[PDB]
Amino acid sequence: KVGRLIYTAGGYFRQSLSYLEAYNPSNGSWLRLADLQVPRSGLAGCVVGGLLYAVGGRNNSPDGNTDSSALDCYNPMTNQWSPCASMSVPRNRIGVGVIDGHIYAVGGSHGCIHHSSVERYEPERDEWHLVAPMLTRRIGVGVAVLNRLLYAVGGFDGTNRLNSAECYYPERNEWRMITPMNTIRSGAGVCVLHNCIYAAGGYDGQDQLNSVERYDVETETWTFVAPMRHHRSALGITVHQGKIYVLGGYDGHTFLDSVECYDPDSDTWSEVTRMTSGRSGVGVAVTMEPC
Ligand SMILES: COc1ccc(S(=O)(=O)N2CCc3ccc([C@@H](NC(=O)c4cccc5c4-c4ccccc4C5=O)C(=O)O)cc3C2)cc1
Ligand SMILES: [Cl-]
Ligand SMILES: [Cl-]
Ligand SMILES: [Cl-]
């Protein structure tokens, strides 16, 4: 269990960013690691087999605004990025989840197109294949996996921001709606802790949110927990050693550098570190420290 870092890839501040930086909760340190080959905001991160993957996003720069179909793989042992097979379609404001060593890419936008499509990557074959689409088009969608089921939470369908959520059952290649959240959320941080899916922050169409709610997959209810100290949309999120970490985002005024940590036993959030610069729209995941 020792030696794991929280990696943050990409993001946005004035333009899309190429940063890869890693935080060590055990000593408070940050490391700046190899830049992404292509800057991207609105991407997702995940880990399979000790390797960090950056999926989708958009490169917003002074010279263009290009949605990404890319999958790139970072090896901590070499501090190098390598390209992998690209997805069927560009997906900005994507969500991803991992089931049994496979990466699921969910939703996202391509220009004015709001995807319901979903595709699955096989690392051993370096291949993507489309699976059943969601029941709803969703960009800015939060995705997480619990008990080998994939959840897609909130987002924006092209007309309305959403409180709805749905679950993918892989053995039936089928999506079904679940109970909707209490709050409309696009750009929330979504993760899994114990037997619940958490949705933290986001934008409800009017304001960035500090509220946090969790879906108990047995009882099918959403319950609010303690709110974050900061309102935040387009935040990064991960779980590490039984606590939720939220990174950056936008509070309606500032691109935040603060990182907050949720302790479920006390139902409290605390500020634990600051990123090296404020940013939103990052991808976050946990893996071993680099060489
Ligand atoms: C070209 O400029 C960019 C700026 C930031 C980014 S991003 O990577 O951070 N990101 C991608 C993922 C994602 C998902 C949901 C939302 C939700 N919006 C908001 O909270 C929102 C609403 C009103 C005004 C603003 C924002 C916002 C949010 C963040 C930064 C600045 C602002 C801002 O001023 C929503 O639309 O639901 C926003 C994003 C934004 C990308 C491009
Ligand atoms: Cl699978
Ligand atoms: Cl298979
Ligand atoms: Cl595989």
Q: Whose CA is nearest to atom 34 of ligand 1?
A: 252
Q: Which residues touch 126 (CB under 8 Å, ≥6 apart)?
A: 84, 85
DSSP state of 158: S
Give how far the C-alpha of residue 209 lies from the chain's centroid of Cα atoms, to the nearest Å. Answer: 17
- Please check whether residue 250 is in contact with residue 256, taking contact to mean a CB–CB distance below 8 angstroms: yes
State the first-to-last Cα distance of the chain, in angstroms, to the nearest integer: 17
The preferred substitution site among 233, 237, 247, 254 for testing ligand 1, maximizing ligand atoms within 8 Å of CB, is 233
Rg (CA), the chain: 17
How far, in Å, CA of 169 to CA of 234, rounded?
A: 27
Ligand 3 centroid to residue 104 C-alpha, Å: 13
- Our answer on whether the CB atom of 187 is closer than 6 Å to any ligand 1 atom is yes
- Classify 27 as helix, strand or coil: coil
- Our answer on whether the CB atom of 142 is closer than 6 Å to any ligand 1 atom is no
- Please check whether residue 200 is in contact with residue 185, taking contact to mean a CB–CB distance below 8 angstroms: no
**Six token digits for residue 205:** 């169409």
User: What was the resolution (in A) of this experimentally determined structure?
Assistant: 1.2
Q: Which residues touch 81 (CB under 8 Å, ≥6 apart)?
A: 34, 36, 37, 54, 72, 73, 74
How far, in Å, CA of 231 to CA of 250, rounded?
A: 8
- Please check whether residue 250 is in contact with residue 257, taking contact to mean a CB–CB distance below 8 angstroms: no
DSSP state of 280: B
Spans of all domains in the chain: 3-291
DSSP state of 207: S
Q: Which residues touch 282 (CB under 8 Å, ≥6 apart)?
A: 8, 9, 10, 11, 41, 43, 45, 236, 247, 248
Query: Within the chain, what is the greatest distance between any pair of CA atoms?
Result: 49
Closest CA to 192 of 162, 163, 149, 138: 149
**Six token digits for residue 254:** 């500032």
How far, in Å, CA of 139 to CA of 221, rounded?
A: 23
DSSP state of 171: G
Q: Among the bound ligands, name the one nearest to the CA of residue 98.
A: 2
How far, in Å, CA of 100 to CA of 145, rounded?
A: 10
Closest CA to 21 of 284, 216, 252, 209: 284
**Six token digits for residue 67:** 């949605």
Tell me, which fold does domain 3-291 have in CATH? Neuraminidase (2.120.10)
How far, in Å, CA of 7 to CA of 176, rounded?
A: 32
Q: Whose CA is nearest to atom 37 of ligand 1?
A: 186
DSSP state of 278: -
The CA-atom distances, in angstroms, between 95 and each of 33, 86, 225 are: 23, 16, 23
Q: Among the bound ligands, name the one nearest to the CA of residue 120.
A: 2
Q: Which amino acid is at 41?
A: S
- Please check whether residue 142 is in contact with residue 209, taking contact to mean a CB–CB distance below 8 angstroms: no
